[PDB]
């Protein structure tokens, strides 16, 4: 209701199935907005692990509403699609380790984060290298906690690992179907 109609959303994606009915009830005046559940767990809960969010909200003495720009200056050099893809990758890495990932996020001692924004300022190829390092980091725990080789991961399932979709099958006896 605060935002104008031009900036009003028309597709709300919810990362938890529990907040599908409450949104439908509270969006009862906005039938033209589709509320979509996400079966893949996006790493949006790991942004509070960032140094600029945790301590900021722990010591907030009163409830309030704040605005951040998760795309610091990427939009000036890359489109929002690549910005969101690298943001999802970074958040997945932070959710995975938050210890080695913080080391990866700064590649050189000369890379600093200005107080204006959250992520450090890097060159384009520097961001490429950081992203490939973080992809290796994200594949590392899948290789470890699942005892599988990273090379055994096809390009189709690495994408599922990054996004956050996983499958299990306790009932293998259903092999009777074939």
């Amino acid at each position: 209701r605060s935002l104008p109609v031009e900036e009003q959303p028309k597709q709300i994606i919810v990362t938890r199935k529990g907040m599908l009915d409450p949104l439908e009830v509270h969006l009862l005046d906005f039938p033209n907005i589709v509320i979509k559940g996400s079966e893949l767990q996006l790493p949006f809960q790991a942004c509070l692990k960032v140094e600029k969010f945790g301590d900021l909200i722990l010591k907030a003495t009163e409830p309030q509403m704040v605005l951040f720009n998760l795309y610091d200056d990427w939009l000036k050099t890359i489109s929002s699609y690549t910005a969101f893809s690298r943001l999802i990758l970074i958040l997945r890495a932070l959710h995975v380790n938050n210890d080695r990932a913080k080391v990866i996020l700064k590649p050189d001692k000369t890379t600093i984060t200005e107080p204006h924004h959250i992520w450090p300022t890097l060159t384009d190829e520097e961001w490429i290298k950081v992203e490939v390092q973080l992809k290796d980091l994200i594949l590392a725990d899948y290789g470890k906690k699942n005892n599988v080789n990273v090379a055994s991961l096809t390009q189709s399932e690495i994408r599922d690992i990054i996004l956050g979709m996983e499958i299990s099958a306790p009932s293998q006896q259903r092999q009777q179907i074939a």
């Binding site: 039938p31 509403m65 704040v66 605005l67 951040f68």
Partner: protein, 103 residues
Amino acid sequence: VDPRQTQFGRNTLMDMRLSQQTVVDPKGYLTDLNSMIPTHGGDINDIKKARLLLKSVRETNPHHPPAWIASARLEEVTGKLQVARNLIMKGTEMCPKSEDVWL
């Protein structure tokens, strides 16, 4: 029905946020004196599920005037105009300082 007719012819919000080199932008919290959303006739698909969810809202936030307003107006669009009066009366018993519920 219209006065001349003869034989032969919702879930409002009390929270507002005005939007306007710092990472933190605490935007002011505003409260609207009254909010009367149109009835939105027929916008509800599952009447029973919506009724249960609005009951849940009333239980979790008894001091939320929009909850009572939407819960009773759902009975008014349904045609059960008698339970809506009871819902508004209970809301007044639980939200007496909101002039919207009294109106």
